[PDB]
Nucleic acid binder design. Structure first.
Lengths: 59, 243, 168, 124
RNA sequence: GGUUGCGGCCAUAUCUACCAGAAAGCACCGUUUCCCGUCCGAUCAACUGUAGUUAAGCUGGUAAGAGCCUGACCGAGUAGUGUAGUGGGCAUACGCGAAACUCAGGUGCUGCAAUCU
RNA sequence: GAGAACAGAAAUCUCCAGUAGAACAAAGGGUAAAAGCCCCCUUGAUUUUGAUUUUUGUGAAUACAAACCAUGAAAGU
């Protein structure tokens, strides 16, 4: 019994680990892209602050 | 990116290529529709390099249909090898398709011009084809405004000027000026014309030529079609990829 | 190999951004007009700034565009002022390049204190045959990657004709 | 969608109302949506449609005009007409039946074989 | 079979990267007296297809790619839900019955006319 | 985003990306060779005859024909 259940659960754990590895690679590069975009956005809104720019009227 | 691609909304294929304008197309094709079938006929003129196209189209959910179609490559049979894309040549093609359609309907009807994407300008070859067709006798609505020689400074028109344009007067006077001023550009731009040694009165007579010829037989003497379907197909499949 | 994939000059735009609007603009007007042969274009201000000392719709610059042999002729007579020595920069990513000159009198035109002195910015756009696909109306498209201009190709063309240097 | 204009609508035809957001003109009738009415007259620009609207406990008759963009042909009577034509054919064949419809009947006797399908016994 | 023109359905067609395209055409491309318009024959207008090019565009294949579409004895007869009971302290009985996700597969199909080794 | 003398985060110029993230009387629908900006011409925001929905009172919007008109080469509006 201990022989049988451990190869079956081991194969299933292999499937689990492949799923997890894949999802984490994808979300990792996604997170890197979003983080660089966030930093770029922060840097541009840093210099836009020097502009007076009442956003309302039309100037 | 993924989100931008997903939220993207593609236009129609015929629009993604710069080929049609549905804004104009609906105003054309849409009928009164109190009258039910009443198919609306439109003459479609198109200019590519080296060749002109003039067709008469009805459109339907099958997608459309071509009852009559002519091109400028037919005019060598009618008496002109040269200048197929010019104003007079498109005028001749329009007269050709008009007499053709009037022959097939047997009357000697009402067709609406399609401009395409070409700009509406005074002295345009689309309006030359218009005048050819109206020549032919199909009643198309139009105004004398956009024919060439329309003095923009007032509401008048000189018929002799567009008569000269029909006969090919601008190309002829440019030939004369470039000839008696130079021969480099002349030999470059008029090699066939130079080998032929054609006149101004000459070329007007040739256009009269071709006019009477299309009035004689507009019945679409078709091409000879050497090397029938399977030859073309197999030779093209030699160079067509496959998965 | 390059039978048609060459790198001709397309056009040069010469621009004069003035601190003030008026007869100074008209004089810069006249300068570019006499340099080109044709009539230039007056550009207004987009919005008010109040630190550069201007306001909306104030006619604060004048510029002109030139195409043809005239463009590269004027380009060479202007680059004589910069004595054929640009920088690693002054070349865009997409394959264009420009510079700026003070004392416009350093190309042919004399002092003439009638009017004064102006500086101007040259910018020069490069291409090959086939740019019409993104400029026409019917049939509009875009150009492939292999045929795209680039800083490297332009810099090589420049270390070639005009026989210049990069200076860093 | 240009196929929403090459659509003949003769007096008598039945159509559903489903107005699309893409045309601000003639957006009709907030609750006339997914409701069916036959066409009484047609002009340019236009089609007539009548609907039996109930108020209290009587069906009164509301006639209306709509742009062609919102209306749509109804497939309500497809099986009705198919069955009518098939009934004509079957009546001709009889003249040479239960052409009426019938609900799902109890399935009849049959035989189930065991050639390669031996029954597989099992448990929870 | 290839291509051009007009279209229908509107990503199975779109995006990204690379490659191939005999012939046909299409396209870049050559010129600016007139019709015309441009700050600027770059666009638009006109002329000859002559000087010349498949480089580009366009067409087609390719990617354990993105997306888009289809299907699943995929999820699952699960969740949820209508009805009954002196059933327990949520199951049972007769019934109805999903979706997301996951997995797999695919990557434009066509109408009219004309034309080509 | 890259790039150009004075000129910098914002003055003017050029190129690339950019399904709308802009504008159309502030988190929303609809609109991209437009329903947006600029340009050309006009002032149909005009009279007569009836029809429909909102609503018995009107008004509002809606389609519908005849005329005078504008517009575009035209379809048509």
């Amino acid at each position: 019994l201990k022989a049988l259940k451990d190869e079956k659960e081991e194969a299933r754990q292999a499937k689990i680990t492949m799923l997890k590895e894949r999802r984490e690679k994808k979300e990792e590069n996604e997170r890197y892209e979003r983080l660089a975009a966030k930093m770029h956005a922060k840097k541009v809104e840093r210099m836009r602050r020097r502009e007076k720019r009442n956003k309302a009227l039309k100037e | 990116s993924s989100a931008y691609s997903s939220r993207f909304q593609t236009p129609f294929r015929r629009r993604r290529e710069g080929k049609t304008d549905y804004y104009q197309r609906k105003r054309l094709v849409t009928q009164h529709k109190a009258k039910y079938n009443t198919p609306k006929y439109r003459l479609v003129v198109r200019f590519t390099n080296k060749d002109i196209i003039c067709q008469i189209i009805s459109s339907t959910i099958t997608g459309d249909v071509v009852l009559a179609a002519a091109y400028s490559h037919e005019l060598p049979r009618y008496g002109i090898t040269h200048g197929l894309t010019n104003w007079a040549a498109a005028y001749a093609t329009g007269l050709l398709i008009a007499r053709r359609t009037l022959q097939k309907l047997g009357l000697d009807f009402k067709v609406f011009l399609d401009i395409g994407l070409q700009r509406t300008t005074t002295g345009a070859r689309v309006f030359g084809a218009l005048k050819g067709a109206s020549d032919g006798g199909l009643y198309v609505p139009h105004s004398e405004n956009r024919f060439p020689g329309w003095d923009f400074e007032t509401e008048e028109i000189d018929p002799e000027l567009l008569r000269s344009y029909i006969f090919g007067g601008h190309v002829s006077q440019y030939m004369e000026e470039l000839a008696d001023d130079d021969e480099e550009r002349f030999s470059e731009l008029f090699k066939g014309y130079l080998a032929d040694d054609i006149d101004a009165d000459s070329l007007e007579d040739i256009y009269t030529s071709a006019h009477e010829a299309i009035r004689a037989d507009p019945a679409f003497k078709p091409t000879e079609k050497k090397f029938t379907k399977e030859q073309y197909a197999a030779e093209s499949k030699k160079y067509r990829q496959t998965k | 190999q390059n039978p048609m994939r060459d790198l001709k000059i397309e056009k040069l735009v010469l621009n004069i951004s003035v601190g003030e609007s008026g007869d100074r603009l008209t004089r810069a007007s006249k300068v570019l007009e006499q340099l080109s042969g044709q009539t230039p274009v007056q550009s207004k201000a987009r919005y008010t700034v109040r630190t550069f000392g201007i306001r909306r719709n104030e006619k604060i610059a004048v510029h002109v565009t030139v195409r043809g042999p005239k463009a590269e002729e004027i380009l060479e007579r202007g680059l004589k002022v910069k004595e054929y020595q640009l920088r690693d920069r002054n070349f865009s990513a997409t394959g264009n390049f420009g510079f700026g000159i003070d004392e416009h009198i350093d190309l042919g035109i004399k002092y003439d204190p009638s009017i004064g002195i102006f500086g101007m910015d040259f910018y020069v756009v490069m291409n090959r045959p086939g740019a019409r696909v993104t400029r026409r109306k019917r049939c509009k498209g875009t150009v492939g990657n292999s045929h795209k201009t680039t800083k490297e190709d332009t810099v090589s063309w420049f270390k070639q004709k005009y026989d210049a240097d990069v200076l860093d | 969608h240009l196929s929403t204009y090459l659509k003949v609508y003769k007096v008598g035809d039945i159509v559903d109302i489903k107005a699309n957001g893409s045309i601000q003109k003639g957006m009709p009738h907030k609750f006339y949506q997914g409701k069916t009415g036959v066409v009484y007259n047609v002009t340019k620009s236009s089609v007539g449609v009548i609907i039996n609207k109930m108020v209290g406990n009587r069906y009164l008759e509301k006639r209306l005009n709509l742009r062609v963009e919102h209306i749509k042909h109804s497939k309500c009577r497809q099986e009705f007409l198919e069955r009518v034509k098939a009934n004509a054919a079957k009546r001709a064949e009889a003249k040479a039946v239960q052409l009426k419809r019938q609900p799902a009947q109890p399935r009849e006797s049959r035989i189930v074989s065991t050639e390669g399908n031996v029954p597989q016994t099992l448990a929870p």
